[PDB]
């Protein structure tokens, strides 16, 4: 019930502030330097991640376990990133599907 198609929309729905004042403050107890590392000027990676997804086909966006080196060396060629860059997105996404399945009401405790 979740995939890249839905995960991508979550990025476009960031039109309104996108968290420039929200997520930026969702960490009162900053770990010396956690903020800037997350936002990253809001373009260092926050934008790249989207571009990498835009260069993906409807099939890849639907099934994340069907992408190989033949597809990784293609997305980076169009987006402009590298091979490891595209891999990071898949990794961070793998930990998302596992989290968006073990909860119900908020998932708090």
């Amino acid at each position: 019930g979740f995939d890249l198609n839905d995960f991508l929309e979550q990025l476009r729905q960031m039109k309104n502030m996108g968290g420039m004042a929200s997520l930026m403050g969702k960490l009162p107890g900053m770990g010396q330097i956690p903020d800037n590392v997350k936002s990253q000027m809001d373009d260092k990676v926050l934008v790249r991640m989207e571009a990498i997804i835009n260069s993906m086909t409807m099939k890849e966006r639907a099934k994340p376990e069907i992408i190989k080196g033949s597809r990784k060396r293609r997305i980076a060629a169009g987006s402009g990133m590298q091979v490891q860059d595209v891999n990071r997105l898949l990794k961070q996404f793998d930990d998302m599907q596992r989290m968006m399945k073990k909860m119900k009401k908020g998932g708090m405790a």
Partner: peptide, 8 residues
């Protein structure tokens, strides 16, 4: 809460 989880 969607931004308090996907970003958490």
């Amino acid at each position: 809460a969607a931004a308090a989880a996907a970003a958490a």
